[PDB]
Amino acid sequence: PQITLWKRPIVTIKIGGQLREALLDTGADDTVLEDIDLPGRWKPKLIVGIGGFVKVRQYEQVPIEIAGHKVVGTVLIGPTPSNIIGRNLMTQLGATLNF
Amino acid sequence: PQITLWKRPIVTIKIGGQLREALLDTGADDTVLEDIDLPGRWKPKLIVGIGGFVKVRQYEQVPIEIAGHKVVGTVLIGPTPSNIIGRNLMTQLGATLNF
Ligand SMILES: COc1ccc(S(=O)(=O)N(CC(C)C)C[C@@H](O)[C@H](Cc2ccccc2)NC(=O)O[C@H]2CO[C@H]3OC[C@H](OC)[C@H]32)cc1
Ligand SMILES: [Cl-]
Ligand SMILES: [Cl-]
Secondary structure (H helix, E strand, O other): OEEEOOOOOEEEEEEOOEEEEEEEOOOOOOOEEOOOOOOOOOEEEEEEEOOEEEEEEEEEEEEEEEOOEEEEEEEEEOOOOOOEEOHHHHOOOOOEEEO | OEEEOOOOOEEEEEEOOEEEEEEEOOOOOOOEEOOOOOOOOOEEEEEEEOOEEEEEEEEEEEEEEEOOEEEEEEEEEOOOOOOEEOHHHHHHHOOEEEO
16 A cells, blocks of 8 residues: 555554554654563563653564564564554565655 | 665755754654754643653744755754654655555
8 A cells, every 4th residue: 555644654453363553653663562462482672762761572573464464573562652563564564655 | 765664764854054864754743853953932842752751842834855855844853862754744745655
């Protein structure tokens, strides 16, 4: 699909059998979700944003479906005001910005 | 231009006669710059990010050049770890996400 930016570029995701919405976020290196359970081991990581720092759980090689497209990548679980899909996963979709 | 997202989508901006770089950020409703002087009146505003909140100055009808394209819009000045171009200005470029 092609998306204009008059509205937030929100897509449906499926992860660990859970359905959620997330923002396609070219400003995010990494993918960060709040409202989700993932199984298995994970590494503490700190990530910064406008308001400072957030402590997140790093989960590696997570299967995720983003607007129908199946990928495997790193997912961070932690407090975020919005679920965000970062460039780590958008590169798997072959996503481009056009102007 | 069309760009891919293997690297951060950073563009050159010119604002109030100052040259800077900024991230094209589909996850940002608003444009937030740290390292710049704008003249005239402005309004307190609080904006929420990953890590919480930053206090910013809202400047309206600011002339800005983004990768060669002249626009006028709202610019927030405040602490941000990265200068960001939000959808308020990317819609003025006719920017789209494609996958
Ligand atoms: C290395 O890994 C990451 C590091 C940082 C981030 S981030 O979320 O902090 N961020 C980085 C930017 C600030 C350099 C990505 C942004 O797209 C972020 C994504 C985002 C979206 C919503 C809430 C919080 C964060 N957006 C905003 O903070 O937007 C601000 C500014 O405009 C307003 O619109 C939305 C917010 O208002 C709600 C305001 C993500 C992954
Ligand atoms: Cl739109
Ligand atoms: Cl990844």
